[PDB]
Amino acid sequence: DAATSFLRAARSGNLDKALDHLRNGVDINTCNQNGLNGLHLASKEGHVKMVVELLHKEIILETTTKKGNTALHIAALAGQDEVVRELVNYGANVNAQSQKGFTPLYMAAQENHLEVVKFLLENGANQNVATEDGFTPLAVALQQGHENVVAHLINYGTKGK
């Protein structure tokens, strides 16, 4: 009940209720049946203040879900530019790979999130990391028609971090 209420508050962005559960003793690393903790749920919904507050209370930043997605993966797939920036500012691994081999750059590129793609490239995301299918962020954006993303990935090339 307490952990479920905390996760619901994290998903809804109710920072005050979530801060109360942690005072009362709800472990910050609790996750739902899908392996998503409070940081994942806040990153999905763009709740930057909740993300910052949870990072301050020592949540594990590189905790993966049952699909192997980190909080940066979820923020990139959801296109939350400010949450992506905040996660990277606190030391999120931009080159993390999920179970199927997806990187945050791949999730941002397949979803036509140009700002997230540009930010992840400027932070040293290696666009040569392929999935288990052999697909790159460039290859998925070509298939999905994401031309603004295809341009930025080719024009950046390897400016690195």
Partner: peptide, 19 residues
């Protein structure tokens, strides 16, 4: 931001699905 795009409604291969 996702207007005029088939990926919103249809299944495409080599896509990350879910969270």
């Amino acid at each position: 931001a996702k207007y005029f795009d088939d990926q919103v409604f249809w299944k495409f291969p080599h896509l990350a699905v879910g969270f």
